[PDB]
Amino acid sequence: AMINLHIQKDNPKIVHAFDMEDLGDKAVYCRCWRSKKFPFCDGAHTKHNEETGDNVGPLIIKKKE
Amino acid sequence: KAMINLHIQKDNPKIVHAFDMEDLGDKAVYCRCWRSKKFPFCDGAHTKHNEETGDNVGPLIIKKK
Ligand code: FES
Numbered sequence: 241a242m243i244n245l246h247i248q249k250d251n252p253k254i255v256h257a258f259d260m261e262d263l264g265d266k267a268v269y270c271r272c273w274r275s276k277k278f279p280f281c282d283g284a285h286t287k288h289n290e291e292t293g294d295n296v297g298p299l300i301i302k303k304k305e
Numbered sequence: 306k307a308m309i310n311l312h313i314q315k316d317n318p319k320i321v322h323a324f325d326m327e328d329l330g331d332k333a334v335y336c337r338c339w340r341s342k343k344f345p346f347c348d349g350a351h352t353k354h355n356e357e358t359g360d361n362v363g364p365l366i367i368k369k370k
């Protein structure tokens with residue numbers, strides 16, 4: 241079973257790299273590959289977990305203050 | 306139909322991680338495949354997953370400019 245079904249299949253290995261100085265107060269990253277705003281989390285994980293019995297969720301990067 | 310996460314912290318109904326930028330060193334490499342033994346960090350387990358399944362997933366990198 242593949243994890244990613246539909247995102248950038250012309251790319252043989254999908255990596256995103258961001259500079260933390262370019263981030264705002266908060267960025268929420270998708271780890272389920274179901275987001276329509278990938279690499280960002282759009283809440284699609286909830287549907288995925290419900291349908292499959294899985295327990296996956298996002299990665300949050302934030303400023304302490 | 307298929308779960309993405311097979312084995313990681315299955316007693317947690319939704320696995321979410323949250324980090325403050327200030328505690329990140331120069332580079333953090335986060336796993337998006339749910340196969341790393343250092344989860345939430347990437348340990349290169351994605352390469353085997355991709356080879357085994359024909360998938361194209363890889364990590365999220367947060368770094369200093
Ligand atoms: S949409 Fe994928 S983790 Fe939230």
Ligand code: FES
Nearest residue numbers: 336337338347350
């Ligand atoms: S080990 Fe999972 S993305 Fe690298």
